[PDB]
């Protein structure tokens, strides 16, 4: 048609490309891949629905005046432990359906009767599988039991990394359980695509947190947790504290970042505060006073009401965030992560890195037609290119001024000449800082 | 009681990820910036105000052989900048490397200006390129 002519009532959102893209590691098997991308709410909720913790993270991630323009979600591997809690006869005993990767179904049928236990008809079903020639291959099993308990844990075995043994009906008492430490995960989940930047996970346990943010901090990668310990609040000398959020301000990890919400748990605040910076430039942005739509202020646990002094000069001490009240606007405060560097700067520097290594990708890939030769003229052209880089930061607003050094063509050893590589070059930037706080007296006479 | 040695083959200009290589005869390089450092206003009783300018920006002149090749890599780099829309960049530091420390100053955010007045004749005439600066910055050795 000459004019193709749509009109609809939906308020228009705007989309903006920053630096990094987040992604979430959760807990649930919907899809057999490691990570998959999701560029709406919508798109989210065809493969999860409202009480899944995903969903949550999703839904509050897309709440903020941009809009950000992709959210990768990752999954772990998770274990089962089918139990019975019942043993009588037949019935049903049934319908496992061990879907394992591939896309194989194989369900299962009533294992048994006649003076028949739960230890009996798991052991079976173990048989059963073990015979079916489409998931003993990939798939391991063990029945612990250990009498009545009757515990029958399945995990995958072999190249396929996608299990899932839901079963219909009573007969079957299923669970489901993520069986896979820190490294494990992040190991697995690295192994598909390492593209993303911001990182949070839908686990909770103080091991797991602590871990994950370990590995984390050997890499250049930002770690995003929230958190709900009452203890935090408490007290005030570090090593008297032993939680979560004290830990890690100990362990001095730069590159994790804690916010103490109320909502915890239950729901995940820190994807609003991811959605704060992840559409913006960084470096030039402040992470310190922001405003979240739709998050409140720090609730106390037991009064519900914001914090007192106090407790904010406590999370304070142990590096944390939180959503302080100032005049009944909830703001974030401090924009810092435990071990006492802003986050700005960190995602300033991972910036100026991912900068670097793109322009001089850029300058060292499109040299088709010929060479750059080791002499003083290379040399000179990647220190330009640095530099350009480097002036790229500054114009920005997050350096002010920069030097690089780079080695002469006679001081570079035939062992380095030979490989073709250049090494020991060093640069230097001095950071232009941002205010957030005001200190006023008055006098009035 | 000697000072350094001057080897103008040992000076490289690079811009924009490329160098320029390839030097007039005579003169080849020319660094200006366009106002002074300060200006004086003298009142009429003979007192003295300095007004100290606030413009850095300086032009570089760089003058190549007739038939170098960078001659025809300025000409194709110029020729995809006009292109581009004005949203990209169309800039980058000019950096000179001079080990005699003869040259004093590298160019920020650089750009180019003029292109070359092209002259034929009996003889070989120069193809003199111009850029401009952002801030024409004075380093030192000297720390």
């Given at each position: 048609?000459?004019?193709?002519?749509?009109?609809?009532?939906?308020?228009?959102?705007?989309?903006?490309?920053?630096?990094?893209?987040?992604?979430?590691?959760?807990?649930?098997?919907?899809?057999?891949?490691?990570?998959?991308?999701?560029?709406?709410?919508?798109?989210?909720?065809?493969?999860?629905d409202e009480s899944t913790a995903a969903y949550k993270a999703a839904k509050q991630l897309w709440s903020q005046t941009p809009?950000?323009?992709?959210?990768?979600?990752?999954?772990?591997?998770?274990?089962?432990?089918?139990?019975?809690?019942?043993?009588?006869?037949?019935?049903?005993?049934?319908?496992?359906?061990?879907?394992?990767?591939?896309?194989?179904?194989?369900?299962?049928?009533?294992?048994?009767?006649?003076?028949?236990?739960?230890?009996?008809?798991?052991?079976?079903?173990?048989s059963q599988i073990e015979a079916s020639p489409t998931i003993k291959d990939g798939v391991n099993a063990s029945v612990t039991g250990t009498g009545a308990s009757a515990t029958m844990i399945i995990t995958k075995a072999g190249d396929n990394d996608?299990?899932?043994?839901?079963?219909?009906?009573?007969?079957?008492?299923?669970?489901?359980?993520?069986?896979?430490?820190?490294?494990?995960?992040?190991?697995?989940?690295?192994?598909?695509?390492?593209?993303?930047?911001?990182?949070?996970?839908?686990?909770?346990?103080?091991?797991?947190?602590?871990?994950m943010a370990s590995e984390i901090q050997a890499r250049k990668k930002i770690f995003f947790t929230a958190n709900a310990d009452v203890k935090a609040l408490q007290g005030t000398d570090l090593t008297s504290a032993t939680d979560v959020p004290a830990q890690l301000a100990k362990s001095k990890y730069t590159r994790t970042v804690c916010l103490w919400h109320h909502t915890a748990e239950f729901d995940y605040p820190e994807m609003a505060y991811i959605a704060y910076g992840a559409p913006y430039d960084a470096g030039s942005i402040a992470w310190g006073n922001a405003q979240l739509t739709?998050?409140?202020?720090?609730?106390?646990?037991?009064?519900?009401?914001?914090?007192?002094?106090?407790?904010?000069?406590?999370?304070?001490t142990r590096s944390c965030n939180f959503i302080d009240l100032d005049g009944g606007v909830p703001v974030v405060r401090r924009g810092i992560t435990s071990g006492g560097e802003w986050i700005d700067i960190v995602r300033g520097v991972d910036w100026l890195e991912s900068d670097?290594?793109?322009?001089?990708?850029?300058?060292?890939?499109?040299?088709?037609?010929?060479?750059?030769?080791?002499?003083?003229?290379?040399?000179?052209?990647?220190?330009?290119?640095?530099?350009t880089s480097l002036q790229r930061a500054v114009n920005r607003k997050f350096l002010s001024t920069y030097?690089?050094?780079?080695?002469?063509?006679?001081?570079?050893?035939?062992?380095?000449?030979?490989?073709?590589?250049?090494?020991?070059?060093?640069?230097?930037?001095?950071?232009?800082?941002?205010?957030?706080?005001?200190?006023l007296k008055g006098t009035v006479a | 009681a000697m000072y350094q040695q001057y080897s103008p083959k040992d000076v490289v200009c690079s811009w924009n990820g490329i160098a320029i290589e390839g030097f007039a005869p005579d003169s080849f390089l020319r660094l200006q910036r366009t106002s002074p450092l300060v200006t004086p206003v003298v009142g009429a009783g003979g007192q003295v105000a300095?007004?100290?300018?606030?413009?850095?920006?300086?032009?570089?002149?760089?003058?190549?052989?007739?038939?170098?090749?960078?001659?025809?890599?300025?000409?194709?780099?110029?020729?995809?900048?006009?292109?581009?829309?004005?949203?990209?960049?169309?800039?980058?530091?000019?950096?000179?490397?001079?080990?005699?420390?003869?040259?004093?100053?590298?160019g920020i955010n650089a750009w180019l200006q003029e292109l070359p007045q092209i002259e034929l004749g009996r003889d070989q005439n120069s193809k003199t390129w111009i850029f401009g600066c952002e801030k024409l910055d004075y380093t030192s050795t000297i720390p």
């Open positions: 048609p000459i004019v193709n002519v749509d009109i609809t009532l939906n308020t228009a959102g705007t989309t903006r490309e920053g630096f990094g893209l987040p992604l979430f590691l959760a807990s649930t098997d919907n899809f057999e891949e490691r990570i998959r991308g999701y560029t709406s709410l919508t798109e989210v909720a065809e493969d999860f809009k950000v323009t992709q959210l990768y979600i990752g999954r772990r591997t998770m274990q089962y432990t089918v139990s019975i809690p019942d043993t009588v006869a037949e019935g049903s005993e049934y319908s496992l359906t061990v879907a394992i990767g591939g896309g194989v179904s194989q369900p299962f049928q009533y294992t048994a009767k006649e003076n028949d236990t739960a230890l009996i008809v798991l052991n079976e079903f173990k996608f299990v899932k043994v839901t079963s219909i009906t009573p007969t079957t008492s299923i669970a489901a359980t993520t069986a896979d430490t820190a490294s494990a995960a992040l190991a697995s989940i690295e192994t598909y695509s390492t593209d993303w930047y911001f990182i949070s996970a839908e686990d909770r346990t103080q091991q797991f947190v602590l871990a739709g998050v409140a202020a720090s609730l106390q646990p037991a009064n519900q009401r914001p914090l007192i002094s106090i407790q904010k000069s406590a999370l304070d670097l290594k793109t322009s001089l990708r850029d300058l060292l890939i499109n040299q088709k037609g010929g060479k750059i030769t080791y002499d003083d003229t290379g040399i000179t052209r990647i220190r330009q290119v640095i530099e030097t690089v050094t780079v080695p002469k063509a006679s001081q570079v050893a035939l062992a380095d000449k030979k490989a073709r590589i250049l090494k020991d070059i060093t640069f230097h930037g001095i950071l232009a800082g941002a205010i957030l706080d005001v200190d | 300095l007004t100290r300018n606030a413009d850095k920006t300086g032009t570089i002149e760089i003058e190549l052989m007739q038939t170098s090749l960078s001659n025809q890599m300025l000409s194709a780099i110029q020729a995809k900048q006009d292109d581009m829309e004005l949203e990209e960049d169309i800039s980058s530091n000019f950096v000179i490397y001079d080990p005699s420390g003869s040259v004093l100053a590298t």
